């Protein structure tokens, strides 16, 4: 093989909205995960079920690079067993998650003077999302007993709201680009990889 293209995900020019989170099924090699950990560019770098140093020391199959954009207060939601707007209705991590949560501030990138619609999120949902479920339905939500016929109005709301990304916003409301690395380790005797 050769090098592994983590630059395509982290250094992407544009990210997907959180409700329509992009998933990058990479499978070329293993890169030096110990290189990405000590990178000061990433402020949130939390791993689960495995230590960051031993990722290159371990062995897995498909490694999914989930990437999307949320706000600073919603960063702590990208974690197992959390709830809220994002964790329940946009991107859900399982209780037995095996991977890492990488996040960094993207106010210098995804914010525009006067707001930045673009990035959106699913407001509500009849039930909480399954783990790794992507809901991209743009159907008008029927909050009352009267049908909506796809019309916005009373008890008929558009299920997606746009983030209002301005540079003058507080850091808790600033855009944060998140990369969720999910990979399925092998099942060898505790000698080869264990």
């Amino acid at each position, epitope marked *: 093989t050769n090098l592994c293209p983590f630059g395509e995900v982290f250094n992407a020019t544009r990210f997907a909205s959180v409700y329509a989170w992009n998933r990058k099924r990479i499978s070329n090699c293993v890169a030096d995960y110990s290189v990405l950990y000590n990178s000061a560019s990433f402020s949130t770098f939390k791993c689960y079920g495995v230590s960051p140093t031993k990722l290159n020391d371990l062995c897995f199959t498909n490694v999914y690079a989930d990437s999307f954009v949320i*706000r600073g*207060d919603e960063v*702590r939601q990208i974690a197992p067993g959390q*709830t*809220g*707007k994002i964790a*329940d*209705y946009n991107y859900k991590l399982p209780d037995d998650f095996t991977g890492c949560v990488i996040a960094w501030n993207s106010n210098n990138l995804d914010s525009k003077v*006067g*707001g930045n*619609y673009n990035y959106r*999120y699913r*407001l*509500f949902r009849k039930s*909480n999302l399954k783990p790794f479920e992507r809901d991209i339905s743009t159907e008008i939500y029927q*909050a009352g007993s009267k049908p909506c016929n796809g019309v*916005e*109005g*009373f*008890n*008929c*709301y*558009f299920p997606l*709201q*746009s*983030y*209002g990304f*301005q540079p003058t*916003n*507080g850091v*808790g*409301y600033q855009p944060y680009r998140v990369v969720v690395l999910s990979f399925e380790l092998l099942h060898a005797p505790a000698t080869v990889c264990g």
Partner: antibody
Amino acid sequence: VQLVQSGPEVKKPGASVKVSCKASGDTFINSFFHWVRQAPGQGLEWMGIINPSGVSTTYAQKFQGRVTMTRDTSTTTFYMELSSLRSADTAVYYCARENGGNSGDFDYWGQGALVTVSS
Amino acid sequence: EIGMTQSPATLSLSPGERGTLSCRASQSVSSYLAWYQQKPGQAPRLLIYNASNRATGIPARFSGSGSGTDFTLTISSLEPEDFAVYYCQQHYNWPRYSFGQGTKVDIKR
């Protein structure tokens, strides 16, 4: 960030009142707006919500058919119109911003507008 | 709709004491719960959102815990500025919101 409400008003029983809420500072995109009243001898009572964009309002059960919440499609002024006023409608009416939705926050409030209903 | 019950109706503790305010929901609201402080003659002020997250600029002595039906607002060390009525608010079903009856926090004398 600032929420400015209209002056206080006194109305006869059966009349209607429209309270304004002029807002400035932060982008009101991605920020819903609510209306909550506090009767003098009572606590907070939620009335309804209006989204930043086109209406898509939701009113509380006790106010269904009595309140109409609109916007000023310019001055980012959110209106609460309450019809068929009775003595129990005498209360201080607050407007409040909600980021995101669902959870969100009542981060910032207005000063409150006293509506006094009596003959 | 969802009914919210706060207990006790009034809590009277001295400055420096540990304060515990309860908020019970008629049905599970997951972590969809927010706490508020209203000083006399003032508009309410958010303290905790999503049951356990501290809002911006809120003093560290305020904290929240709980999920589903039982929620708790804790003031680790009461200060005189904390004399107020505290309301909890549900939002599990996005369109609608209800408040608790409020627990008035008095400075015990």
